[PDB]
């Protein structure tokens, strides 16, 4: 099963200039926990934005290039991405925008945090169809002194 984990701020914007400019511990906590000890899939310029290995995953890089860091397994191919995950219950899409879209038609499953904060942004979560993704799950939370805006975290599954 292929899965996408994405945090979303208004008008679908994920990242502005390589990096997400905002700060919300409890949304990093809510990935840590979904991701640990399954293999995450990200494109090289989110491996770039990361900036280091994500500890306890088995980090997976898409790139037309060859690799950098033998930290990471290095892939050509969506399809060689998949592979390299092995016979695992579910594989983390964890982005950027390009992959997204790749990964999207294949996933049954999104696991994604609606924020609300205003971005000015150059990356967004691919536009998907409502139609097709019911919502299993949803914990609403107001901003509090560690989480400057509210936040919604919702699981979607694949009609
Ligand atoms: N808010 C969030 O949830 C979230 C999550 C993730 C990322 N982000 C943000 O998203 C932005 C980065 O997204 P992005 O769309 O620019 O880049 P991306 O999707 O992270 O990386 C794209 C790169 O991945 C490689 N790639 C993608 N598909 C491939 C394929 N089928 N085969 C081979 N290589 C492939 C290419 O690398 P080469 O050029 O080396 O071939 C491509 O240039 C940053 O702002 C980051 O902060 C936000
Ligand atoms: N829900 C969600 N929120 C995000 O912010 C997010 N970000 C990315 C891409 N960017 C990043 C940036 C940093 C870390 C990171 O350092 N995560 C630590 C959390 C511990 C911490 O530094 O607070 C990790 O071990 O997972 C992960 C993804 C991909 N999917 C996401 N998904
Ligand atoms: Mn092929
Ligand atoms: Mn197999
Ligand atoms: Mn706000």
Same mark, same amino acid.
């Given at each position: 099963?292929?899965?996408?984990?994405?945090?979303?701020?208004?008008?679908?914007?994920?990242?502005?200039?390589?990096?997400?400019?905002?700060?919300?511990?409890?949304?990093?906590?809510?990935?840590?926990?979904?991701?640990?000890?399954?293999?995450?899939?990200?494109?090289?310029?989110?491996?770039?934005?990361?900036? +280091?290995?994500?500890?306890?995953?088995?980090?997976?890089?898409?790139?037309?290039?060859?690799?950098?860091?033998? +930290?990471?397994?290095?892939? $050509?191919?969506?399809?060689?991405?998949?592979?390299?995950?092995?016979?695992?219950?579910?594989?983390?899409?964890?982005?950027?925008?390009?992959?997204?879209?790749?990964?999207?038609?294949?996933?049954? $499953?999104?696991?994604?945090?609606?924020?609300? @904060?205003?971005?000015?942004? #150059?990356?967004?979560?691919?536009?998907?169809?409502?139609? #097709?993704?019911?919502?299993?799950?949803?914990?609403?939370?107001? @901003?509090? @002194?560690?989480?400057?805006?509210?936040?919604?975290?919702?699981?979607?599954?694949?009609?």
């Amino acid at each position: 099963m292929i899965s996408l984990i994405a945090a979303l701020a208004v008008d679908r914007v994920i990242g502005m200039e390589n990096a997400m400019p905002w700060n919300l511990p409890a949304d990093l906590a809510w990935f840590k926990r979904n991701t640990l000890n399954k293999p995450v899939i990200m494109g090289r310029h989110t491996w770039e934005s990361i900036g +280091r290995p994500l500890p306890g995953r088995k980090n997976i890089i898409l790139s037309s290039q060859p690799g950098t860091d033998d +930290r990471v397994t290095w892939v $050509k191919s969506v399809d060689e991405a998949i592979a390299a995950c092995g016979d695992v219950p579910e594989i983390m899409v964890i982005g950027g925008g390009r992959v997204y879209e790749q990964f999207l038609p294949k996933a049954q $499953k999104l696991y994604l945090t609606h924020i609300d @904060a205003e971005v000015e942004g #150059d990356t967004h979560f691919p536009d998907y169809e409502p139609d #097709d993704w019911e919502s299993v799950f949803s914990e609403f939370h107001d @901003a509090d @002194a560690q989480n400057s805006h509210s936040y919604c975290f919702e699981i979607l599954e694949r009609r």
